[PDB]
Amino acid sequence: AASRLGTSAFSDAPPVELRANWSEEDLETVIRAVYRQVLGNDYVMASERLVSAESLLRNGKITVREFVRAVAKSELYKEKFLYGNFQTRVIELNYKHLLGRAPYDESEVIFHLDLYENEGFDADIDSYIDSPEYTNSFGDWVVPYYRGFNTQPGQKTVGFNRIFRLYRGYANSDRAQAEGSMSRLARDLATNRANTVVPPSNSDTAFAYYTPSADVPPRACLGGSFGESGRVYRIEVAGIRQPGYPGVRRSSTAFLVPYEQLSAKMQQLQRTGARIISVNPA
Amino acid sequence: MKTPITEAIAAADTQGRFLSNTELQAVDGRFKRAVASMEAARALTNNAQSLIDGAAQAVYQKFPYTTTMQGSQYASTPEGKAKCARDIGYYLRMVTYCLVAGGTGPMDEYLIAGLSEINSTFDLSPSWYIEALKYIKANHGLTGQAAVEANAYIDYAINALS
Amino acid sequence: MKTPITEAIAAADTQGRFLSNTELQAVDGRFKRAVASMEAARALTNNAQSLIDGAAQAVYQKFPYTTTMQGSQYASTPEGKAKCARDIGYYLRMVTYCLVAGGTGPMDEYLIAGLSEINSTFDLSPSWYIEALKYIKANHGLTGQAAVEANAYIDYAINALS
Amino acid sequence: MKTPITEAIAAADTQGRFLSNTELQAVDGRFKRAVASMEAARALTNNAQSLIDGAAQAVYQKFPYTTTMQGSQYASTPEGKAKCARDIGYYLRMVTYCLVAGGTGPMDEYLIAGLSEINSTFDLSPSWYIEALKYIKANHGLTGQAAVEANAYIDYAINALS
Amino acid sequence: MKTPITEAIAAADTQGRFLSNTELQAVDGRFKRAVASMEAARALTNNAQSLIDGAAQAVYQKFPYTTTMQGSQYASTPEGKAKCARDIGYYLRMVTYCLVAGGTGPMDEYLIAGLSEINSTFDLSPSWYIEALKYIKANHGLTGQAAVEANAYIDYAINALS
Amino acid sequence: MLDAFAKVVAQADARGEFLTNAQFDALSNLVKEGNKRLDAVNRITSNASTIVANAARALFAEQPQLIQPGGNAYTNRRMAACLRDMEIILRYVTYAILAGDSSVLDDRCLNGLRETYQALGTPGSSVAVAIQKMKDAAIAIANDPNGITPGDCSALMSEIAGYFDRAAAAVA
Amino acid sequence: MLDAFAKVVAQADARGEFLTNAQFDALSNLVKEGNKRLDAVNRITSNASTIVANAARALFAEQPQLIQPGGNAYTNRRMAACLRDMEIILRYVTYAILAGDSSVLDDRCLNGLRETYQALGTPGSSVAVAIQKMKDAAIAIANDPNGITPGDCSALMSEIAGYFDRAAAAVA
Amino acid sequence: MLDAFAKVVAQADARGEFLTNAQFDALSNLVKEGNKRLDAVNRITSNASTIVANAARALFAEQPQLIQPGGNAYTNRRMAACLRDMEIILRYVTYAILAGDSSVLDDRCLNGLRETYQALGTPGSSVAVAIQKMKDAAIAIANDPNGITPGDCSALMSEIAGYFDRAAAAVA
Ligand SMILES: CCC1=C(C)/C(=C/C2=NC(=C\c3[nH]c(/C=C4\NC(=O)[C@H](C)[C@H]4CC)c(C)c3CCC(=O)O)/C(CCC(=O)O)=C2C)NC1=O
Ligand SMILES: CCC1=C(C)/C(=C/C2=NC(=C\c3[nH]c(/C=C4\NC(=O)[C@H](C)[C@H]4CC)c(C)c3CCC(=O)O)/C(CCC(=O)O)=C2C)NC1=O
Ligand SMILES: CCC1=C(C)/C(=C/C2=NC(=C\c3[nH]c(/C=C4\NC(=O)[C@H](C)[C@H]4CC)c(C)c3CCC(=O)O)/C(CCC(=O)O)=C2C)NC1=O
Ligand SMILES: CCC1=C(C)/C(=C/C2=NC(=C\c3[nH]c(/C=C4\NC(=O)[C@H](C)[C@H]4CC)c(C)c3CCC(=O)O)/C(CCC(=O)O)=C2C)NC1=O
Ligand SMILES: CCC1=C(C)/C(=C/C2=NC(=C\c3[nH]c(/C=C4\NC(=O)[C@H](C)[C@H]4CC)c(C)c3CCC(=O)O)/C(CCC(=O)O)=C2C)NC1=O
Ligand SMILES: CCC1=C(C)/C(=C/C2=NC(=C\c3[nH]c(/C=C4\NC(=O)[C@H](C)[C@H]4CC)c(C)c3CCC(=O)O)/C(CCC(=O)O)=C2C)NC1=O
Ligand SMILES: CCC1=C(C)/C(=C/C2=NC(=C\c3[nH]c(/C=C4\NC(=O)[C@H](C)[C@H]4CC)c(C)c3CCC(=O)O)/C(CCC(=O)O)=C2C)NC1=O
Ligand SMILES: CCC1=C(C)/C(=C/C2=NC(=C\c3[nH]c(/C=C4\NC(=O)[C@H](C)[C@H]4CC)c(C)c3CCC(=O)O)/C(CCC(=O)O)=C2C)NC1=O
Ligand SMILES: CCC1=C(C)/C(=C/C2=NC(=C\c3[nH]c(/C=C4\NC(=O)[C@H](C)[C@H]4CC)c(C)c3CCC(=O)O)/C(CCC(=O)O)=C2C)NC1=O
Ligand SMILES: CCC1=C(C)/C(=C/C2=NC(=C\c3[nH]c(/C=C4\NC(=O)[C@H](C)[C@H]4CC)c(C)c3CCC(=O)O)/C(CCC(=O)O)=C2C)NC1=O
Ligand SMILES: CCC1=C(C)/C(=C/C2=NC(=C\c3[nH]c(/C=C4\NC(=O)[C@H](C)[C@H]4CC)c(C)c3CCC(=O)O)/C(CCC(=O)O)=C2C)NC1=O
Ligand SMILES: CCC1=C(C)/C(=C/C2=NC(=C\c3[nH]c(/C=C4\NC(=O)[C@H](C)[C@H]4CC)c(C)c3CCC(=O)O)/C(CCC(=O)O)=C2C)NC1=O
């Protein structure tokens, strides 16, 4: 299941280490890929590229690790993400761009935030860059890639869910996303709450399903529900627009429905135009 | 999959450039080889029963212990014989897919990926399938460059099992 | 360079696997097209001087102001006319390198890289060379698929300059 | 290697702090258990020859096909019987090493690392060594906690082969 | 918290391996020491009132200036005396928690974390608490290994303050 | 990324069995018309820059509010981004034409584009108009009857239109 | 991550009261039967590979739709994934048994596993069936009365059954 | 990396002269015998695994010191490394054969390879013996006259031998 989830093809690793480290062409590719991963697929204009770093990069004086750090600490990166977002959101973006994953638990935010508060941002990026994870998955000669999709390293299951919150498509950039300018994985991270996977748009209608548990039914039924034979299936929906009496209200929401009624409820929801995000047993 | 067409497309995409004459030449080569490739695929898929049943008997002869020793990993039981037929059929089906695809992509993704883990966990010694593939490589009954293509993919499987 | 042969080799090298039939098919296509490619290269080189001088006059006619306005970035002086001849000769020599290499490797590495930087610093507007390449593309005097491929490379250069 | 003492040292080294009382307690427990571990190691090495020979016969009985089938990877030849007496001996030697080291370090560095690769290149079957290890675990002739530790290492190898 | 059992589990989890006999031996040592640990913890908590009030008076005697000088940081007011009692109680409670947990975990998570910052911002000179810790170390009322382990943890706290 | 051959193989793998004679004939039809496919993709790639440039000039002539101050194609940085995105759509459509399947077009390029533009504020309908301008230009360039050995090509031209249409509809 | 002793300490710290005598004796009881706990984790970890393999054979015999083409445990790489994600659950359950609490099992393995499987398409009922297949095998292998000094282990067996069941229900 | 075509064009670009008629006909000769080159590389790569395995068995039989305890091809981890490097050399030589030039053989192999073996302490002379065994195996399999169209490919066989010799001399 590749196309719907969004992982079109992320199925190899681009090193630059070679006898021909320049390789006369391959270095161009490596530079592009670093820009795509570190700057979050931002469209960097030609004039503002970090020419000084690339100089040392071909010369061999700096490794790919040093190149990634140079971009990460350069003001090019800072203007896009660091200066303009909530600090916790910046921590999330750092995890996405440098270590190719999402925060697995609240302790990650605790540690990185404390670094930022005392040592400064430069030290925060340093910690990501030289963390054991970066040193192992990548190797100072391998451009960072989104390894969060693969589960081989050893990670909390929630990680998979969480990475799909940050990656909202191949085309998407974190400077320009549906929920941008505010924390995307903050309220959930404190409560260790799982997230339903929101597939990115693909030649069909899209309705980004925000999931604030402030006003939603619980994940479980927490009762007998209607009491009819069979368990209680929780159905989510986003784009409810047709029946606006005061204005529909809470256009994106979930309903806990007993099994026997699901069919009926389904058609009602389809009538309003909302595309059901998920139907999970509760 | 690692199809010649898709490989050229990916090569152009990682550099960001529009499809150059290099990639077009590559896909043209694939189209030129496709006539023989499709002939070979037709031969394998139209004679599948002979190839698979004969391969099953060939592995039973090469490794007699596999058709006597008691245990689930062996085909001594009739259920195991059915399993052997199904898996040999899977191998032939994948080789036909690879023949029509024009590359080794399909067998990479639906056979070779993680083959070691499975062959170790369920005690399925790779040598069995290696000998079966040898039989298929000898009885395919192809000729010309079509035979060359079919044998190339079969030997890819053989070397991957090893 | 991005030569079809070495592109296939690199594609196999990044995945650490022996050359599969995919890459072999690609190289086969390159060899098949090489007959026409070499014919085209011979054609362009044999009448190279004629085409170079014709293109120089073409640019002079399309942009008369380039032959009159005083400045270092103009061909008003005989030295400027000499440098103009040298540049258009470079473009033709590079296209004949690209024809023989079998891909856009030579054009990419020995030209087209930082071309924007140079054309902006010394104030040589790309349009001049674009029109010159257009003249070459119209007067090359090739026929058939040889003409097709020569045009394709020239137009790659044209679009790169733009 | 992954010896208890050294892993405690590495754990302190990653934090950059002097050895705290927790680590010292751990290594004290290691030293307390070392007396029994070394007694068990002496016992295992004193009857090593009988164990190795008995395991070689056990695998011959479980897999008679391996003593008749012609080929390099079989014990049908006296050279193959020598190879069996070599490899089974290596596994028993590694078990004694693990017993002395108080951890799986030696097993990982000298046996398990790359075991998957070797059993596929030389056409060896892991089941052979698994059966031999089972014989060793049944005839080790140890008692008590020392027996528990030895059987744990043997089973580590068994599960690694599988 | 950083408790021996959980630390071993986390060490195994970061490498994705089943709990090998090294970790099991460590936890066994923990259980073997737990009898004395629980005895010491029960003794400390049953006599906690004496050790908290006496420690308060001990710091009042070692530092007369802390119970007279005007200021919020001092205990000259009865409210300040209550604050002092509560903090000494916190230290004693944490030592009991650490004794029950068999490791430094509780002490580091609920006390040592940011202890320097808080003592340096609210003007709570660490010398006060280290003297109080010394008093409770002296009247610990513990003997044998129960004594030694408890005093070790107390010493950890004093070294953490300074 | 799936191409035509790969698409047929993947369906056949889902159902197991073995490649049917009908599927063989379909692929043979694909290869016997392959020269046409390659010629079309070559023509479109050779004029990529002029296609994008001409379509851009037309778009900004037809919808001036985009380039007026405060619109999304203003400030010379967003203009660069807009030109980039037009060229990228053309590039992935060219990929699709060479492949013969639209899987590549929806798997990377159109995968997430809708929400990207929704968040940016860029008018999706205008982008669709621009893609349609490119559609007419490129199909005319490929269907130019002079310059190559004549023959039937209308099916391939309709396929090119289909790819451009898919992109334009998904953005709007 | 809270082990038994840490759990008691944390719930005493939240209330702010010294450990009460009742809690003391509860922990002492846990220490008294600790050797049994270590024995159980040793047995399961010693035969992990065989446990997973046998349970897998049973699962594919009882639910053939997995092995049948087009399913979720077909194509030999998804077979590898299925074996991996059975042994993963076994591993985290063994962690839980050694800990004496389900905290690690619910924090790092089963905390949203349901949603991940939902997105992938992996049938969530079948994973529960697989966990049950492993449950009977593991409980039997741990309760094997031959090979160790005899005694009571029924309580510990019920505890590990509880861990397996918690995971099986949370993944369904 | 410069294959044969790329090599000649690169030196001609360094001199700055249009490709001369002699160079054109040399390249045409290369293309005329290209089918032979492709056939040879296909046959070598089809038997890669067997070539490496048989050569390895022979090397360890002729030089038992390597597999004796304390030797460099002991410990089963170093055995895996040795097999890996033998197959790596075979892989890069096959790349070289397809290219027609030794550029790939020298760039990404043999360049700073002698030093690595020398620092590790692995005998380079033994590595050379292994390369020679693989040379005989590959030249025999690549000149096998049964199962193929007739012809004479002795020139290509000598070229293959030259590549292997270059590697063996660079490591020893
Ligand atoms: C501390 C700032 C800094 C400096 C100084 C620097 C120097 C520098 N100049 C380079 C290239 C170069 N520099 C030149 C320069 C010259 N060619 C000539 O004919 C002239 C005599 C001369 C200019 C006056 C050339 C030709 C190259 C290209 C080398 C090549 O790729 O073949 C390279 C090779 C790698 C690359 O191009 O990135 C480095 C590292 N890099 C830096 O980051
Ligand atoms: C934009 C910069 C920024 C802010 C503001 C921020 C807030 C923030 N404050 C936190 C903690 C906290 N913040 C407070 C704050 C207070 N408690 C009180 O009793 C007072 C009423 C109040 C201070 C006057 C507390 C108690 C915690 C700890 C919560 C916990 O561990 O559960 C945490 C939890 C993670 C951690 O402790 O590392 C965050 C994310 N994070 C940021 O990156
Ligand atoms: C390879 C597939 C792919 C696509 C398609 C893609 C789209 C894409 N277009 C963007 C921007 C943009 N896209 C436009 C587009 C337009 N504005 C207009 O007025 C026109 C109607 C229209 C062009 C036809 C503009 C103006 C921006 C820049 C907005 C900004 O950065 O402020 C951005 C992010 C902001 C940035 O440029 O940094 C993305 C991610 N990203 C991808 O990876
Ligand atoms: C009492 C609290 C309350 C709020 C806040 C509320 C919001 C609300 N506004 C809606 C519609 C809408 N709201 C807008 C609003 C805007 N359109 C624009 O172009 C602007 C950018 C923006 C105003 C400046 C639009 C266009 C719709 C219709 C959407 C549609 O039919 O697709 C809808 C969809 C269903 C409906 O139309 O009834 C909701 C739920 N409803 C409520 O009951
Ligand atoms: C489409 C790609 C694909 C492959 C290759 C594949 C192999 C494969 N073969 C299997 C079993 C098997 N394979 C065999 C095969 C043989 N038995 C013999 O005696 C012979 C010597 C040999 C045939 C030549 C047998 C008997 C089993 C069942 C073993 C068991 O139940 O434990 C299993 C275990 C699950 C099962 O019971 O089917 C897998 C996964 N599965 C796949 O999805
Ligand atoms: C192989 C790749 C390559 C290219 C493309 C190249 C071009 C090139 N042409 C140049 C100059 C020049 N080229 C011209 C050429 C022209 N005068 C005209 O009237 C025409 C419109 C035009 C020819 C079409 C002129 C006038 C200058 C001098 C500009 C100056 O000194 O200000 C310069 C500046 C340094 C110099 O004087 O050589 C470069 C780098 N050099 C290269 O190595
Ligand atoms: C120190 C750790 C270590 C291990 C484990 C090891 C395994 C190992 N066993 C090998 C061969 C072998 N292993 C066997 C073993 C067996 N034959 C049978 O019939 C039985 C069922 C089984 C023994 C009970 C045989 C016969 C060979 C020779 C195969 C050949 O030369 O092709 C080889 C190839 C080199 C050789 O011929 O010795 C290695 C590397 N090598 C090591 O250095
Ligand atoms: C659970 C871990 C923990 C510790 C250790 C802790 C210390 C601590 N002690 C405090 C105050 C205080 N602590 C004292 C303690 C003393 N006065 C004396 O004369 C003695 C020498 C000494 C006792 C030995 C006093 C008087 C204050 C009040 C100071 C003020 O309000 O400025 C405060 C300020 C907040 C408050 O008013 O309570 C903290 C945070 N808090 C904690 O949560
Ligand atoms: C570099 C790899 C490569 C390519 C790209 C390639 C293309 C290619 N396509 C061809 C055929 C063709 N070319 C057309 C072209 C057309 N007829 C029309 O009426 C339309 C206006 C137009 C559609 C765009 C047609 C219909 C064929 C098929 C007939 C044939 O195969 O000769 C031909 C032979 C005759 C010709 O040049 O048209 C070549 C060489 N061959 C190759 O080896
Ligand atoms: C450490 C905790 C942990 C868990 C629980 C975990 C589960 C997990 N299983 C996955 C995949 C998968 N899991 C399965 C498993 C199954 N196939 C079946 O037929 C059965 C019903 C089922 C086994 C019982 C399959 C087939 C995939 C691949 C799905 C795909 O690529 O489309 C993936 C996606 C990434 C990957 O391939 O690894 C995750 C994250 N990963 C983890 O790190
Ligand atoms: C390396 C870590 C480690 C292990 C493995 C270990 C084992 C161990 N198990 C023991 C006994 C025992 N083992 C059991 C176990 C069982 N009773 C049953 O009915 C079941 C069939 C079975 C559950 C597995 C019981 C009840 C005792 C006696 C009481 C006890 O100590 O647990 C004893 C004490 C008496 C003796 O020496 O036999 C030890 C030392 N000790 C350790 O430090
Ligand atoms: C996909 C990559 C690829 C391969 C592998 C391939 C094989 C291939 N070999 C061929 C011919 C040939 N192959 C040979 C090969 C040999 N003659 C000998 O005496 C030797 C023992 C052996 C070389 C070592 C010869 C002599 C010809 C015919 C004449 C020639 O093409 O030079 C031909 C052309 C005529 C034909 O057989 O159909 C092909 C297509 N073609 C390809 O496109």
Residue numbers in the entry:
A (entry chain Z): 6 to 287
B (entry chain E), C (entry chain A), D (entry chain I), E (entry chain K): 1 to 140, 143 to 150, 161 to 174
F (entry chain F), G (entry chain L), H (entry chain B): 1 to 72, 75 to 174
Per the authors:
PBS is composed of phycobiliproteins (PBPs) such as phycoerythrin, phycoerythrocyanin, phycocyanin (PC), and allophycocyanin (APC).
The PC rod is formed by PC monomers consisting of α-subunit (CpcA) and β-subunit (CpcB) to form two PC hexamers, inside which linker proteins interact. As CpcG1, CpcG2, and CpcG4 show similar amino acid sequences, CpcG2 assignment in this study is tentative. The interaction between PCs and linker proteins in the PC rod is asymmetric, which is induced by the interactions between CpcC, CpcD, and CpcG2 in the rod. Although there were no major differences in the structure of each PC monomer comprising the PC rods, the interaction of the linker proteins in the PC rods caused a significant shift in the arrangement of Disk B in the PC rod. Disk B interacts with CpcC and CpcG2, and the “CpcD-like structure (residues 234–287)” in CpcC specifically interacts with the CpcB region (residue 109–122 [orange]) in monomer 9, with this interaction being very similar to that between CpcD and CpcB in monomer 3.
